[PDB]
Design a protein around this ligand. Structure first.
Ligand SMILES: Nc1ncnc2c1ncn2[C@@H]1O[C@H](COP(=O)(O)OP(=O)(O)CP(=O)(O)O)[C@@H](O)[C@H]1O
Ligand SMILES: CCCCCCCC/C=C\CCCCCCCC(=O)OC[C@H](O)CO
Ligand SMILES: CCCCCCCC/C=C\CCCCCCCC(=O)OC[C@H](O)CO
Ligand SMILES: [Zn+2]
Ligand SMILES: [Zn+2]
Lengths: 114, 104, 114
């Protein structure tokens, strides 16, 4: 039961680390937090409201996992000299697909609002 | 691969079992409630997302442990970043269930 | 705007790599355009059309993050000469749950529409 408070602190510590270190996290988080607020104040149904929010929050989840992968690569880079960067490319690709998805979700749903 | 990973996640990780139960409860409750298709999908997939992220989080932790059990700044950062992603998935899941059930 | 062009180039470098390296991604890539076409060809509402696409997109995202983890393990595997499959299994386990989710989504939604 106390493992929750322990894991909560780690999560909060990871959020700060993401925010402090990753620049892509800060900019995306801004556009994400903006989108979340708008979705909370639109004239739409629950299914649409959720779809707008979740597609946007997915960008943050992927970006957080991308940063974790990059931190792993950096850990390797401190002990090893050659870095292909292939792992960071795949992580950057994953964030792109998540963003494109969020763009599509919003365009499609708002085209019903119109 | 796939099943070997699900078997290892269920046996060793405890939070994964609390999501596995939650997934079944999600599916059960989503089907027992008189809701539309999109709502039922949203209740299920939002919970399964938490599991998906949890699996990826555990995978990242495994790599870190393999690099070494040695305490480094980037080793703990990677684990905290992974742990943070699982949080957002849960937050997303909680928000999802709220909006859908509030409208009921 | 200079960072964006570089980040996108990384993402494209990551996608171009995933397409050539893994055949699983090629399959999922085909499925996406197929899902988009099927979602648009069918006369369905916006909420469902989004879920039909987002579910398949999620698989491609999880695959990319998995391939990123697989790449890190290989960089390590070359240095350590060890092959512990904890990471690779958990990564593929994640993709499995994603695919299962995509099937449930397509079932529940299309079962309702027809
Ligand atoms: N090698 C390391 N270097 C630095 N910090 C580390 C570390 N290993 C663990 N930590 C720190 O301790 C915390 C707990 O480690 P870890 O996140 O792997 O536990 P966990 O709660 O996920 C247990 P389980 O593997 O059963 O799920 C991490 O979030 C991190 O803050
Ligand atoms: C059809 C009209 C309405 C369209 C509605 C679309 C909504 C998209 C939702 C979320 C954005 C997710 C990605 C956020 C990316 C943030 C980073 C960014 O764009 O940064 C630019 C910056 O200038 C670089 O320095
Ligand atoms: C209506 C509500 C609007 C709310 C505000 C929304 C603003 C942002 C929207 C679209 C820009 C999308 C730009 C996408 C650029 C992707 C670049 C890329 O590849 O990024 C990889 C990433 O940096 C690896 O970490
Ligand atoms: Zn763990
Ligand atoms: Zn952890």
């Amino acid at each position: 039961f106390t493992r929750i408070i322990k894991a909560a602190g780690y999560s909060w510590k990871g959020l700060r680390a993401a925010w402090i270190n990753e620049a892509a996290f800060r900019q995306e988080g801004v556009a994400v937090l903006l989108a979340v607020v708008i979705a909370c104040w639109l004239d739409v149904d629950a299914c649409t409201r959720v779809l707008l929010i979740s597609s946007v929050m997915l960008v943050m989840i992927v970006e957080l996992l991308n940063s974790a992968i990059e931190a792993v690569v950096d850990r390797i880079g401190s002990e090893y000299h050659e870095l292909s960067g292939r792992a960071k490319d795949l992580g950057s690709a994953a964030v792109l697909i998540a963003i494109i998805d969020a763009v599509i979700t919003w365009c499609i749903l708002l085209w019903s609002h119109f």
